[PDB]
Amino acid sequence: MRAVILVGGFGTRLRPLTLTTPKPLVPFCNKPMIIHQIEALKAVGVTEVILAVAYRPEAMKEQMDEWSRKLGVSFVFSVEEEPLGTAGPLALARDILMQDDKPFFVLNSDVTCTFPMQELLDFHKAHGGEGTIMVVTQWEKYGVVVYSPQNYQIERFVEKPSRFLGDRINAGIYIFNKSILDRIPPRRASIEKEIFPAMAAEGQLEGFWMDVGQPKDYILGMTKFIPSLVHGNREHTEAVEHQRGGRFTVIGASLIDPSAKIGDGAVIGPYASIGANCVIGESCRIDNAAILENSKVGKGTMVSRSIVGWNNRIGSWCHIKDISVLGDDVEVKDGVILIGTKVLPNKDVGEHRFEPGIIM
Amino acid sequence: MRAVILVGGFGTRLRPLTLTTPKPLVPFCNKPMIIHQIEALKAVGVTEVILAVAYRPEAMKEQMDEWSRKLGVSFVFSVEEEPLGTAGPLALARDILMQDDKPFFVLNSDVTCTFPMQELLDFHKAHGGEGTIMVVTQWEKYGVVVYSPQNYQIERFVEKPSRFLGDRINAGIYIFNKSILDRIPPRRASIEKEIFPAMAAEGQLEGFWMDVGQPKDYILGMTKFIPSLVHGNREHTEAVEHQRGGRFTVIGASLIDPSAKIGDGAVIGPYASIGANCVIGESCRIDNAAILENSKVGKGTMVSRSIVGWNNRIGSWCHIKDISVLGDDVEVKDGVILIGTKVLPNKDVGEHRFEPGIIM
Ligand SMILES: Nc1nc2c(ncn2[C@@H]2O[C@H](COP(=O)(O)OP(=O)(O)O[C@H]3O[C@H](CO)[C@@H](O)[C@H](O)[C@@H]3O)[C@@H](O)[C@H]2O)c(=O)[nH]1
Ligand SMILES: Nc1nc2c(ncn2[C@@H]2O[C@H](COP(=O)(O)OP(=O)(O)O[C@H]3O[C@H](CO)[C@@H](O)[C@H](O)[C@@H]3O)[C@@H](O)[C@H]2O)c(=O)[nH]1
Ligand SMILES: [Mg+2]
Ligand SMILES: [Mg+2]
């Protein structure tokens, strides 16, 4: 009946875009990352969502703008505890308890997946079935390796193992009962306070899944996510949008906001997202690239596998390839080639850069 | 009676420190960069200072904290016009006119100098005697080259000449009459609207001067500014502070805030500034380096010619040398050598870096 979407965090990995907005609020395809999770929660039975915001309490205005659909007015913060925010639910143990006794969801704000949120009780084991489902199944470099047998028990929980195998990792979606928030409230920073050794049953994804918190991870998660969205959003059959401006061709599926304008002959490539009010030149190539909002693009650029930030002004014949994240209000001169270079907000690029790097 | 301190600007050059606070509010030696100018204006006969803040209107709380001494309560902003903010005085031309008719000062927020603010009329002409005094006398790469003969006239005004010689550049302190704000109010972005090629005189710095807006410029400006401050601030005779914690030695002049703690045997080098609540290890070497606030330093680091941001935690045996600005809340492990690497806020550094660069 309640959920705790952890939104407090510096977003260091997604830095060029998170210097302006918090990581929950940077759009993934056409909506902020938290908005997908909030919509899934609205689909399942829940009304009030509490947010533990630490990095920037200025997200309140944007949440109020998005407050129309759901009662996500709750906001709590006293002092920076941790981006992981284990004390997050513990620092607000009073609100979750007295209002209701139902189990409460806990989610990361940078996770995208099918979002099952099944109405099935699954009361024999709360987090074992959900989160990392047992047949997640990816590299062990990031995320905690979870060792679960066929009987749905968790024995080992190592946040960043060096080399321990165990391709299974937690999805980032947790469901907890009222005992967890009253179990270990140490009143200070901690890491998820997982005490799975003590218990095996009820004490507490068959689908795509990706931790969308890194630029390359952002691109790959968008690539995995757009095909799964073809069923619901806007259902000319090659992609979601195929005729918005002039006459352009689309290869594969893509998300184009009806407010955007596309030039004559642009080739919106596979798994590309175009934001609101964005303008695309005559013969651009948007190949697995995300255009956030209000960005303008000249005639013939090839933004491929990279991210173009808000209010950008891309030149006429640029080439923004590789994984090169552009910040807010970045202007690129004509003919500039950017390959894997991250540009901080409010910068002008006029020189070529053929190697990965940072532009101050 | 009034002054216009231009404070609206992204501070792209001093980027690692200006991602947290606006460039006017980044401390120069022990006080915010704007506080020196406000103190000079308080010394001269003015009472109200109007600030044209654009980049971050959240400086209001800090200004109110510094408001106790002088009535700098004025704050105006509608939409981003320009970091130069030529429309700044023009956007608030109404307030300046009706209250008073006396000439109003215009100052940059990133300029440090002797700050004459002479009670003399400068009635030969107003900006000319002040600002770039006819004798400024530095490189022509930045700032406008001003061609001033012995009769105090300005003929040419080129913002960024390619190669025009003319070592004289404007200091950045302007004084204007009420006609300038009513002369060209174009209502949009413009560059200083200098129409001096029309008028010779009366229509509108023998000391150190430095445009403190770049890291190397910050260091050099501190090096020039500290010796000139020995006359008035705190008047054991080697530096301003020589006994604050244990027993340490000082080479040359330096500012150490009485709230700081210095270890046994630390060598505070020439022209160094230590912020409030800062802790310095046993055998550190602070050679022409600035420690902003609440930063902690281990035993034996040599921070030389670099800037250490707020709330830092420097390791035990690091080498933060060359021009290497550290952002807010940056933690450096023991033995890490940083040479010319700018670190963005909220980062942990554990690897050596022998070449100039940027750490995300
Ligand atoms: N950096 C950041 N982290 C945030 C933010 N909002 C919430 N967080 C939380 O910060 C935690 C850790 O930071 P991330 O970079 O997002 O996660 P991680 O350290 O890569 O790994 C964590 O997430 C995995 C999910 O893929 C999980 O294995 C587990 O949460 C792990 O600790 C996550 O639980 C996430 O909820 C934000 O704006 N920025
Ligand atoms: N970037 C930035 N600029 C600011 C800020 N606050 C005010 N400004 C104004 O922005 C103008 C230009 O930005 P700067 O980087 O500070 O100056 P500049 O472009 O290096 O050169 C300008 O300053 C010289 C003084 O040395 C002058 O020649 C003249 O102002 C010139 O346009 C200056 O007039 C300064 O007052 C800020 O927070 N950030
Ligand atoms: Mg994450
Ligand atoms: Mg300047």
mmCIF file of N, CA, C and O and ligand atoms in Angstrom, chain A residues 6-13 22-24 83-84 107-110 142-144 159-160 170-172 174 192 209 211, ligand 1:
data_model
loop_
_atom_site.group_PDB
_atom_site.id
_atom_site.type_symbol
_atom_site.label_atom_id
_atom_site.label_comp_id
_atom_site.label_asym_id
_atom_site.label_seq_id
_atom_site.Cartn_x
_atom_site.Cartn_y
_atom_site.Cartn_z
ATOM 1 N N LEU A 6 13.981 5.007 -3.636
ATOM 2 C CA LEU A 6 15.209 5.694 -3.252
ATOM 3 C C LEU A 6 15.642 6.618 -4.382
ATOM 4 O O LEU A 6 16.024 6.154 -5.460
ATOM 5 N N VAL A 7 15.583 7.926 -4.139
ATOM 6 C CA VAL A 7 15.936 8.926 -5.136
ATOM 7 C C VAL A 7 17.111 9.790 -4.710
ATOM 8 O O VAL A 7 17.588 10.602 -5.509
ATOM 9 N N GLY A 8 17.592 9.644 -3.480
ATOM 10 C CA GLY A 8 18.713 10.434 -3.012
ATOM 11 C C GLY A 8 20.055 9.843 -3.384
ATOM 12 O O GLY A 8 20.447 8.795 -2.864
ATOM 13 N N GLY A 9 20.770 10.511 -4.286
ATOM 14 C CA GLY A 9 22.073 10.050 -4.723
ATOM 15 C C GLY A 9 22.722 11.008 -5.698
ATOM 16 O O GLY A 9 22.032 11.651 -6.496
ATOM 17 N N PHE A 10 24.051 11.105 -5.654
ATOM 18 C CA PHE A 10 24.752 12.100 -6.458
ATOM 19 C C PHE A 10 24.732 11.780 -7.947
ATOM 20 O O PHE A 10 24.905 12.692 -8.762
ATOM 21 N N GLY A 11 24.515 10.522 -8.322
ATOM 22 C CA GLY A 11 24.528 10.155 -9.723
ATOM 23 C C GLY A 11 25.882 10.374 -10.364
ATOM 24 O O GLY A 11 25.978 10.952 -11.450
ATOM 25 N N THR A 12 26.938 9.918 -9.688
ATOM 26 C CA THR A 12 28.296 10.183 -10.152
ATOM 27 C C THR A 12 28.564 9.533 -11.505
ATOM 28 O O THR A 12 29.260 10.108 -12.349
ATOM 29 N N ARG A 13 28.030 8.330 -11.728
ATOM 30 C CA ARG A 13 28.313 7.626 -12.975
ATOM 31 C C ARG A 13 27.697 8.339 -14.174
ATOM 32 O O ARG A 13 28.343 8.476 -15.220
ATOM 33 N N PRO A 22 18.585 15.654 -10.906
ATOM 34 C CA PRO A 22 18.926 14.403 -10.220
ATOM 35 C C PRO A 22 18.750 13.208 -11.143
ATOM 36 O O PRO A 22 17.969 13.241 -12.095
ATOM 37 N N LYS A 23 19.506 12.149 -10.856
ATOM 38 C CA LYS A 23 19.447 10.950 -11.688
ATOM 39 C C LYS A 23 18.042 10.374 -11.842
ATOM 40 O O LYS A 23 17.732 9.879 -12.939
ATOM 41 N N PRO A 24 17.176 10.357 -10.824
ATOM 42 C CA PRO A 24 15.799 9.901 -11.073
ATOM 43 C C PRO A 24 15.075 10.695 -12.145
ATOM 44 O O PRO A 24 14.226 10.132 -12.847
ATOM 45 N N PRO A 83 23.896 7.519 -0.635
ATOM 46 C CA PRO A 83 23.150 7.299 -1.885
ATOM 47 C C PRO A 83 22.368 6.000 -1.878
ATOM 48 O O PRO A 83 21.239 5.956 -2.383
ATOM 49 N N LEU A 84 22.940 4.936 -1.305
ATOM 50 C CA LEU A 84 22.197 3.693 -1.128
ATOM 51 C C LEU A 84 21.033 3.877 -0.166
ATOM 52 O O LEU A 84 19.995 3.225 -0.317
ATOM 53 N N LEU A 107 12.509 0.374 -4.112
ATOM 54 C CA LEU A 107 13.029 0.325 -5.470
ATOM 55 C C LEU A 107 14.194 1.286 -5.629
ATOM 56 O O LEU A 107 14.295 2.293 -4.923
ATOM 57 N N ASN A 108 15.077 0.960 -6.566
ATOM 58 C CA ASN A 108 16.062 1.914 -7.043
ATOM 59 C C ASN A 108 15.433 2.808 -8.103
ATOM 60 O O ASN A 108 14.509 2.407 -8.813
ATOM 61 N N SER A 109 15.939 4.032 -8.205
ATOM 62 C CA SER A 109 15.412 4.991 -9.166
ATOM 63 C C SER A 109 16.120 4.932 -10.510
ATOM 64 O O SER A 109 15.798 5.727 -11.397
ATOM 65 N N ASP A 110 17.072 4.015 -10.685
ATOM 66 C CA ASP A 110 17.808 3.891 -11.935
ATOM 67 C C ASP A 110 17.703 2.481 -12.501
ATOM 68 O O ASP A 110 18.634 1.993 -13.146
ATOM 69 N N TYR A 142 29.436 -5.311 -11.343
ATOM 70 C CA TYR A 142 28.545 -4.410 -10.630
ATOM 71 C C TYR A 142 27.384 -5.194 -10.037
ATOM 72 O O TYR A 142 26.993 -6.245 -10.552
ATOM 73 N N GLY A 143 26.839 -4.677 -8.945
ATOM 74 C CA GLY A 143 25.741 -5.329 -8.270
ATOM 75 C C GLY A 143 26.204 -6.484 -7.401
ATOM 76 O O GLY A 143 27.305 -7.015 -7.541
ATOM 77 N N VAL A 144 25.332 -6.879 -6.488
ATOM 78 C CA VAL A 144 25.626 -7.950 -5.545
ATOM 79 C C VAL A 144 25.299 -9.297 -6.171
ATOM 80 O O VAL A 144 24.240 -9.482 -6.780
ATOM 81 N N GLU A 159 28.581 -7.255 -1.933
ATOM 82 C CA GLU A 159 28.173 -6.112 -2.744
ATOM 83 C C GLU A 159 28.988 -6.013 -4.028
ATOM 84 O O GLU A 159 28.427 -5.932 -5.127
ATOM 85 N N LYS A 160 30.314 -6.015 -3.914
ATOM 86 C CA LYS A 160 31.210 -5.897 -5.066
ATOM 87 C C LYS A 160 32.297 -6.957 -4.964
ATOM 88 O O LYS A 160 33.442 -6.659 -4.595
ATOM 89 N N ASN A 170 20.898 -9.018 -7.933
ATOM 90 C CA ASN A 170 19.592 -8.482 -7.580
ATOM 91 C C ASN A 170 19.131 -7.468 -8.621
ATOM 92 O O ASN A 170 19.924 -6.703 -9.176
ATOM 93 N N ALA A 171 17.826 -7.476 -8.890
ATOM 94 C CA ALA A 171 17.276 -6.550 -9.870
ATOM 95 C C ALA A 171 17.225 -5.122 -9.351
ATOM 96 O O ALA A 171 17.167 -4.188 -10.156
ATOM 97 N N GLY A 172 17.252 -4.929 -8.036
ATOM 98 C CA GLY A 172 17.119 -3.617 -7.446
ATOM 99 C C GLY A 172 15.740 -3.308 -6.908
ATOM 100 O O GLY A 172 15.561 -2.261 -6.276
ATOM 101 N N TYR A 174 12.919 -4.370 -4.259
ATOM 102 C CA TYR A 174 12.760 -5.126 -3.029
ATOM 103 C C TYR A 174 11.375 -4.886 -2.451
ATOM 104 O O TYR A 174 10.796 -3.808 -2.608
ATOM 105 N N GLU A 192 22.284 -1.425 2.799
ATOM 106 C CA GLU A 192 21.148 -2.317 2.569
ATOM 107 C C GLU A 192 20.848 -3.228 3.756
ATOM 108 O O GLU A 192 19.802 -3.884 3.775
ATOM 109 N N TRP A 209 16.252 -6.604 -18.267
ATOM 110 C CA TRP A 209 16.597 -5.844 -17.074
ATOM 111 C C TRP A 209 17.916 -5.133 -17.326
ATOM 112 O O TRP A 209 18.809 -5.690 -17.969
ATOM 113 N N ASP A 211 20.500 -1.922 -15.283
ATOM 114 C CA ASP A 211 20.761 -0.842 -14.334
ATOM 115 C C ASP A 211 21.129 0.398 -15.136
ATOM 116 O O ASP A 211 22.287 0.588 -15.515
HETATM 117 N N1 LIG C 1 24.235 7.425 -7.756
HETATM 118 C C1 LIG C 1 22.916 7.508 -7.457
HETATM 119 N N2 LIG C 1 22.358 6.505 -6.757
HETATM 120 C C2 LIG C 1 21.047 6.499 -6.412
HETATM 121 C C3 LIG C 1 20.227 7.621 -6.818
HETATM 122 N N3 LIG C 1 18.995 7.398 -6.373
HETATM 123 C C4 LIG C 1 19.024 6.219 -5.728
HETATM 124 N N4 LIG C 1 20.228 5.707 -5.760
HETATM 125 C C5 LIG C 1 20.541 4.457 -5.149
HETATM 126 O O1 LIG C 1 21.921 4.321 -5.001
HETATM 127 C C6 LIG C 1 22.150 2.944 -4.941
HETATM 128 C C7 LIG C 1 23.522 2.582 -5.454
HETATM 129 O O2 LIG C 1 23.920 3.448 -6.489
HETATM 130 P P1 LIG C 1 23.849 2.863 -7.951
HETATM 131 O O3 LIG C 1 25.090 3.213 -8.698
HETATM 132 O O4 LIG C 1 22.502 3.264 -8.417
HETATM 133 O O5 LIG C 1 23.843 1.311 -7.699
HETATM 134 P P2 LIG C 1 25.207 0.516 -7.837
HETATM 135 O O6 LIG C 1 26.142 1.044 -6.800
HETATM 136 O O7 LIG C 1 25.642 0.462 -9.267
HETATM 137 O O8 LIG C 1 24.698 -0.915 -7.373
HETATM 138 C C8 LIG C 1 23.529 -0.961 -6.577
HETATM 139 O O9 LIG C 1 22.384 -1.109 -7.421
HETATM 140 C C9 LIG C 1 22.232 -2.405 -7.961
HETATM 141 C C10 LIG C 1 21.035 -2.403 -8.876
HETATM 142 O O10 LIG C 1 21.543 -2.566 -10.187
HETATM 143 C C11 LIG C 1 21.999 -3.353 -6.810
HETATM 144 O O11 LIG C 1 22.899 -4.443 -6.935
HETATM 145 C C12 LIG C 1 22.294 -2.718 -5.481
HETATM 146 O O12 LIG C 1 21.409 -1.635 -5.229
HETATM 147 C C13 LIG C 1 23.656 -2.120 -5.607
HETATM 148 O O13 LIG C 1 24.059 -1.666 -4.323
HETATM 149 C C14 LIG C 1 21.010 2.267 -5.648
HETATM 150 O O14 LIG C 1 20.353 1.433 -4.697
HETATM 151 C C15 LIG C 1 20.102 3.387 -6.048
HETATM 152 O O15 LIG C 1 18.807 3.176 -5.552
HETATM 153 C C16 LIG C 1 20.898 8.672 -7.576
HETATM 154 O O16 LIG C 1 20.254 9.650 -7.943
HETATM 155 N N5 LIG C 1 22.196 8.558 -7.850
#
